[PDB]
Design an enzyme around this catalytic site. Structure first.
Site, PDB file in Angstrom:
ATOM      1  N   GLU A  80       1.098  -1.360  -0.104  1.00  0.00           N
ATOM      2  CA  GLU A  80      -0.064   0.209  -0.121  1.00  0.00           C
ATOM      3  C   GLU A  80       1.125   1.230  -0.030  1.00  0.00           C
ATOM      4  OE1 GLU A  80      -2.942  -0.326   2.795  1.00  0.00           O
ATOM      5  OE2 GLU A  80      -4.387  -1.314   2.072  1.00  0.00           O
ATOM      6  N   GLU A 133      -5.977  -7.337  -1.185  1.00  0.00           N
ATOM      7  CA  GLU A 133      -6.548  -7.321   0.256  1.00  0.00           C
ATOM      8  C   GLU A 133      -7.711  -6.567   0.149  1.00  0.00           C
ATOM      9  OE1 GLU A 133      -3.575  -5.188   3.042  1.00  0.00           O
ATOM     10  OE2 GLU A 133      -5.642  -4.272   3.429  1.00  0.00           O
TER      11      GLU A 133
END
EC number: 3.2.1.4
Length: 301
Positions: free
Chosen positions: A136, A225
């Site tokens: 991320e 995710e």
């Protein structure tokens, strides 16, 4: 059975396909941080997920910071355990260089290159492995064109020298939400996918439209995710919106991994406090999120 059946994965016309060129969709679980909840990542728990939930992929979330690999590299060995379990169980496995507070993947790029060199040297002749090189990326000073793409163009060659074509998932900006910018400025490697992450506590209609935009540019997207909770990993469970996303991902052939396999007291956690780290969970040992996710994967399988 899964990996023997589908074999070598690749990208064809922006879609994940098996070794016969047919579309395939992976659905499974992510660990939580391996530095915190590594006890839930083992052959027995993964076999239970495969047999009882129907998972066909497992994501090993190796935080880099937050007490993870940079701070204590021993956690690499838990990744190896997960990969070896996946090979033994004939499911796919995602090796996730789980950046977060270290918000620019360039911060630990030298360590990333060394880590992915090692992992691809060890496992690069197995079809099970999928490399996720930057969980991320985030921050307004971390953009696709200036930070993330050049990072990928350093790490991917290292992997490709050992492993010419297993899938590589590359994070996108704004906590792997900015697939639009990635899709307009794609990497050269033909077996790359771009990560997209969502949390069901966020109203998702525009984010779905953005995923469609990216797909329409021929970019392959892996939802590496997602959670049923708010974007903090907590804040309640949002199953109506989760279901809208589940349906969306099935319509678009999007593979996914749910966050996360832990007993932590947060809404996204799949397990209740007393859940056995080696599997066998009764209904009562699954959280509201876990119960839902298990049902989604079982339905699919």
């Amino acid at each position: 059975s899964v990996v023997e059946e589908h074999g070598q994965l690749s990208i064809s016309n922006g879609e994940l396909v098996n070794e016969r060129g047919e579309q395939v969709q992976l659905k499974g679980m992510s660990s939580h941080g391996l530095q915190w909840y590594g006890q839930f990542v083992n052959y027995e728990s993964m076999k239970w997920l495969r047999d009882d939930w129907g998972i066909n992929v497992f994501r090993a979330a190796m935080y880099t910071s937050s007490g993870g690999y940079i701070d204590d590299p021993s956690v690499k060995e838990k990744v190896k355990e997960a990969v070896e379990a996946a090979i033994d169980l004939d499911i796919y496995v995602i090796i996730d260089w789980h950046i977060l507070s270290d918000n620019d993947p360039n911060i630990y790029k030298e360590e990333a290159k060394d880590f992915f060199d090692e992992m691809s040297e060890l496992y690069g002749d197995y079809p099970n492995v999928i490399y996720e090189i930057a969980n991320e990326p985030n921050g307004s000073d971390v953009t696709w064109g200036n930070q993330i793409k050049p990072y990928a163009e350093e790490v991917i060659p290292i992997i490709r020298n050992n492993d010419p074509n297993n899938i590589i998932i590359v994070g996108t900006g704004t906590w792997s939400q900015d697939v639009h910018h990635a899709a307009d400025n794609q990497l050269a490697d033909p077996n790359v996918m771009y990560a997209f992450h969502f949390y069901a506590g966020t109203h998702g209609q525009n984010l779905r439209d953005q995923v469609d935009y990216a797909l329409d540019q021929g970019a392959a997207i892996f939802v590496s995710e997602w959670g049923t909770s708010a974007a903090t990993g907590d804040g309640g469970v949002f199953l109506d919106e989760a279901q809208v996303w589940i349906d969306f991902m099935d319509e678009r052939n999007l593979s996914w991994a749910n966050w996360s396999l832990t007993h932590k007291d947060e809404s996204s956690a799949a397990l209740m406090p007393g859940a056995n780290p080696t599997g066998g969970w009764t209904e009562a040992e699954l959280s509201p999120s876990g119960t839902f996710v298990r049902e989604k994967i079982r339905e699919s399988a």
